[model samples]
Target: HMKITWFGHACFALEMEGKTIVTDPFDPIPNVTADVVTESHQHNAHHLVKGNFRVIDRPGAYTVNGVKIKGVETFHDGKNIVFVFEGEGIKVCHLGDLGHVLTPAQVEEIGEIDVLLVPVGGTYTIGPKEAKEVADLLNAKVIIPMHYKTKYLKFNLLPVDDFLKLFDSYERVGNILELFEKPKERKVVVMEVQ
Candidate 1:
């Protein structure tokens, strides 16, 4: 079982097998730093961090504890490139405050994805519609929505409900403290923030 924890906003901690992986862990409210920061661009929040996990600035692949992580290069605004992480045999991908659509080449490089963690809120990231399009392009089995509005967030963003309204299937999960194995069918797991 692969477990995923969402620390609201764009922060998530994913545990699979025996390895612990954290992504865009911006926390402490407006601090914008993480214990292990994975940056997609050199922007304010995405780049403001110093941590223990190998800070990934470029797009590539890395393996930790037998878990294969493929980092694909993506753009946030159109010119600035951001990095997305792909993990496990399931090919989990995270869209870090992405602002634009995927190019043909980027789509080719991304390949097939099983799980997609995308920002569905507007203003700082792509809205729900665009995110859904990206998911469709990737042929993702499961789509996890993130980077939306909350009382704790300083940025003016949309709520998670905006995204959920667009999708036909959505499963609300309570926590992200456990692990889950790859299922036979693809599913979208919408995690509640603690």
Candidate 2:
């Protein structure tokens, strides 16, 4: 079974088909970073991380370490085209500090998404309303909210409660180390930061 390990914020490790695919890993809490860092925007904190993974900065599809990946190019603040990925029969979209709503072409390129990892904090990315709208646009089965306010977060951002309060059906999983088996049914899984 496929497993998703949310490392808080927008960072996540997706284990599927025997490969580990990590998305935009930046941890300021423990001062640890990811092996491969994906920078969607130019923010120092978002882009700068200490690690050994190949850093990708362009748009389009690519395969790393034997895993097939498709990256759709989209803008963050209407200029920088952030790369979002699709792979392993499960489209996992990571919005790394996305600043605006997606265009029609962008939406068309994204196609059908199963799990959406989005930034809901208002300071650097799209807020809850926009995030929800994007989730609906993608017709995603599961929505994982990220980049929200935490005690350890240095920026002024909206808390996860802002987004969670808007939905009643989402599940809140408090631990980031736990692995969630791929669900048989589609549902929103909100990963709470420890």
Candidate 3:
């Protein structure tokens, strides 16, 4: 079982097995703490965090508090590291400020993804089109979009609806989504900021 919470922008708190793993924390991050933090790049929007968490920003393998984490290098204005966190029989992938589509090798390197957190915003990240392509490539059971246009954001990004337009249906949740088991089919979940 897992609990996922969105804290606006590309930040997320993935809680599982008593461990909270945060991803791509932006400046002035929401009220939350992390046992481990994952950053894709050095951008102010994705690399900032509070307290001294075990921050993983580079490409490599890691295991923190029983959560297996792997950072695969991608791109976004520079080097963006895609992070995958696995625990309690689930694998969650966070595509940090991903600027391009995934290569074949990168896809293979990521292995299986149960829940995928992707950036659907444009300008500095992959827009709707590329987000779709990457989602299709990963074929995750659950897809949660981040880094899109919101009233609180200051960047020029496409609205979440632009990315949702390509899909037939999606589930809208408040700020937190809890999963008791891995989903059987592809599911898109649009979550409000916490």
Candidate 4:
């Protein structure tokens, strides 16, 4: 089974195909070996967690550790690299601190997204409203929000409530979400930062 474990902020450990792929590691990054690590531009908040993992930080297609990844270039406070992973059970997309909505062509290139990890805090990223729009555009079956204000965060950004209120229903998963092959209705989820 594949599972996504969020450490905090935009950092997550995605376990798939017997490898753990880490995304923009931040503080409190558990001392675990990662098979592959990704960077969404050059930013401290995105790569604070130190590790010895393989790096993939460009716009292109790559197959690392048996994970098929495609990076779609975008922009925010600076540049952003959105990644789409074609996994065995599902296709997941991790959108970094994207400041604006994507064009239809970009969405088409991303293809079908089974799950999405997005940023909802306003200042450096898109707010709740824009987040919803991006979600709609991607049409991912599951949405998981990140980069929001929490007790662990030392920022003036809005809380997850700001984004959650935009949606009708959601389920809170402690820190992990196990996906399956059988698709289901679209839904939003909040992952606890471990």
Which candidate leads the pack in lDDT?
3
For each candidate in the order shown, give its overall lDDT on alpha carbons. 0.67, 0.66, 0.85, 0.81
Kindly list the per-residue Cα lDDT of model 3 for residues 1-194, writing each as its tens digit.
Answer: 88998887677889998988887766645677678987787755433555557978789999988889999997644688999988988889998878889999999999878999998888888999899889988888899988888786747888989999999889999989999998788889999964
Ranking by TM-score: 3, 4, 1, 2
Clashes of each: 10, 1, 0, 0
In candidate 1, which residue pairs get closer than 3 Å at backbone N, Cα or C atoms, i.e. clash? Answer: 1-179, 1-180, 1-181, 2-179, 2-180, 3-178, 3-179, 4-176, 40-82, 40-83
In candidate 2, which residue pairs get closer than 3 Å at backbone N, Cα or C atoms, i.e. clash?
Answer: 35-53
Candidate 3 stretches greater than 4 Å from native: 43-52
Q: Please give, for residues 29-54, the per-residue lDDT of candidate 2 as tens digits.
A: 42443444555644444344444556
Q: Which ten residues in a row have the lowest lDDT in candidate 4?
A: 43-52
Deviation (Å) of 94 in candidate 4: 0.9
lDDT of 2 at 139: 83
Candidate 4 lDDT over residue span 10-119, tens digit each: 77888889888888876554655687888888755434444566788888899987889899998644589998887786888999888878888788888778888988
Please, what's the RMSD in Å of model 2?
A: 3.7
Question: How well does candidate 3 match the true structure in TM-score terms?
Answer: 0.90
> Each model's TM-score, in the order given?
0.78, 0.77, 0.90, 0.89
lDDT, candidate 3, at 178: 97
Which regions in candidate 1 have their CA more than 4 angstroms from the true location? 28-37, 43-52, 76-88, 177-179
lDDT, residue 118, candidate 4: 86
RMSD of each: 3.9, 3.7, 2.4, 2.5
Could you give me the TM-score of model 2 versus the true structure?
Answer: 0.77
